[PDB]
């Protein structure tokens, strides 16, 4: 798009012939694409020839622009002749008897937030950090570390994108990024590294109750695709993929001291984030879709997790 550093070279500028409404007539047309959506065509001398990532697996639908992915809460309800029981007995371990129980015909409002490596906007544990796993003796089992207090995350795409519409055949419009207004700069997320560090102390202390006297070591995800190795969102309608390697770092001993002094400090840990538009949703090839771009710039204030360790 303007050569230079991977902050700008994240965007290719690509052109193609496209079919107008008039079946015999093709028009030359152009768009910007994020590098992961694009793959180099073979059978050429390492040239400027490319294709979309999905043409050799499945034709993805563009998501209709009226459709909104926002996590509006769902209540589940029991049919007639059934009842939903729930625990009032909080700080529950996830199996065995609850001492304080209620019926409800409908659940509280649950948000269908889909993500990885963290949850977001989840309801908090009642009085303390709670650690749940189906069998801690087996490393195959996840450890759901349910938090007591909301650490805040701020995420943004600070490029000022313009949307353009490409007319394809009769009565259809593909949508693509036409231009970036003014400055480049990088998509990223910010967490107050003070509150995060305290939270990794407090998870240290509770996780040590199941692993007594041991020092606790956090680390980055081991490896794989972006979908495995990055945290993920849909802020506004963009499928961010953020590298968490600097976040799950350091090792913390049984001392678990309040190293964050009571005085003011402004240390923010920052995550740099890729973006994609063609997504093979929920590891499905036929589930795949193209998200249309969103004009302007994005900000996305949020409360974090019960960690998926």
């Amino acid at each position, epitope marked *: 798009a303007t050569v*230079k550093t991977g902050t*700008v070279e994240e965007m290719k500028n690509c052109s193609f012939n496209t079919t107008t409404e008039i079946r015999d007539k093709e028009k030359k047309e152009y768009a910007l694409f994020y590098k992961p959506d694009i793959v180099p065509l073979s059978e050429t001398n390492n040239t400027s020839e490319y294709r979309l990532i999905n043409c050799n697996t499945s034709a993805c639908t563009q998501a209709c622009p009226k459709v909104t992915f926002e996590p509006i809460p769902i209540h589940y309800c029991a049919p007639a002749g059934y009842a939903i029981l729930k625990c009032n007995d909080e700080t529950f371990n996830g199996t065995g008897p609850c001492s304080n129980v209620s019926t409800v015909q409908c659940t509280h409002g649950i948000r269908p937030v889909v993500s990885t490596q963290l949850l977001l906007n989840g309801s908090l544990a009642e009085k303390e950090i709670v650690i749940r796993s189906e069998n801690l003796t087996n490393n195959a089992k996840i450890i759901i570390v349910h938090l007591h207090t909301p650490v805040e995350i701020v995420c943004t795409r600070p490029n000022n994108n313009t949307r353009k519409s490409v007319r394809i055949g009769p009565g259809q419009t593909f949508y693509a990024t036409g231009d970036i207004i003014g400055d*480049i700069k990088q998509a990223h997320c910010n967490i107050s590294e003070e509150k995060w560090n305290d939270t990794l102390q407090k998870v240290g202390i509770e996780l040590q109750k199941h692993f007594p006297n041991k020092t606790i070591k956090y680390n980055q995800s081991a490896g794989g695709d972006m979908e495995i190795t990055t945290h993920s969102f849909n802020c506004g309608g963009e499928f961010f993929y953020c590298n968490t390697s600097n976040l799950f770092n350091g090792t913390y001993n049984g001392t678990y001291i309040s190293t964050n002094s009571s005085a003011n400090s402004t240390s923010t840990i920052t995550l740099q984030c890729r973006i994609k538009q063609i997504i093979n949703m929920w590891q499905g090839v036929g589930r795949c879709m193209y998200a249309p771009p969103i004009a302007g710039n994005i900000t996305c204030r949020s409360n974090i997790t019960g960690l998926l360790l």
Partner: antibody, heavy 125, light 113 residues
């Protein structure tokens, strides 16, 4: 540090062409807008042109629009102004000055700070 | 467009005395981003301009503390708590809020004798 060095100054006939080179030292030259500003005994100060950090967007004053073009080579820490169709009034002292920063995550307000020591251009042969 | 204008031309003023200069734009210097982008430049005899006061009123790095400033909307001032021999030369206001960036016609500080 942050030091700017203008160079390339000379004499020409009216209607002719000259090129000015500003070389940048002790700052990250990829990360600034850059401006040309010029001085005469009549006017005091006049803005000439602005260029984006990646070289993409460019702006000029009404007095030189289309006649001059501005350019940069971030591989050299270097800015160039190409001047063509030089009028008698373009006879001035030309300065290079550093404008708006564009860091990784954010990009603040407009400036002309610091300034190089300038170069001389004469348009009457 | 933004026209600029400074009120005092010559300042024939004794070393040690306060002085001030006022500059008054044709249109308000407030930018959409919510800062106001005036600055004040000193040119000594035989030198390029350098910037003393900027973002209305902040001192730029290395500037002597005797310089200071104020203002709002279109109207802004540079104040010197005590003028000195090294203050001699021409002062310009300038705006950067709108293209073209534009400059006052100047004011000259001079030793009184």
């Amino acid at each position: 540090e942050v030091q700017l060095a203008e160079s390339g100054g000379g004499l020409t006939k009216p209607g002719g062409s000259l090129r000015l080179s500003c070389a940048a030292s002790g700052f990250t030259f990829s990360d600034f807008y850059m401006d040309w500003v010029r001085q005469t005994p009549g006017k005091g100060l006049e803005w000439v042109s602005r260029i984006n950090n990646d070289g993409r967007n460019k702006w000029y004053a009404d007095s030189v629009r289309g006649r001059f073009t501005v350019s940069r080579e971030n591989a050299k820490n270097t800015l160039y102004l190409q001047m063509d169709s030089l009028r008698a009034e373009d006879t001035a002292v030309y300065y290079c000055a550093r404008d708006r920063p564009v860091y990784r995550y954010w990009s603040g307000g407009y400036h002309l700070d610091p300034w190089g020591q300038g170069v001389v251009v004469t348009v009457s042969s | 467009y933004v026209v600029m204008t400074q009120s005092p031309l010559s300042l024939p003023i004794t070393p040690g005395q306060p002085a001030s200069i006022s500059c008054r734009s044709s249109q308000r210097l407030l930018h959409s981003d919510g800062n106001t982008y005036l600055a004040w430049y000193q040119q000594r005899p035989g030198q390029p301009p350098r910037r003393l006061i900027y973002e209305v009123s902040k001192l730029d790095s290395g500037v002597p503390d005797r310089f200071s400033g104020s203002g709002a909307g279109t109207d802004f001032t540079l104040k010197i708590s005590r003028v000195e021999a090294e203050d001699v030369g021409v002062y310009y206001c300038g705006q950067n809020t709108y293209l073209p960036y534009s400059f006052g016609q100047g004011s000259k500080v001079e030793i009184k004798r």
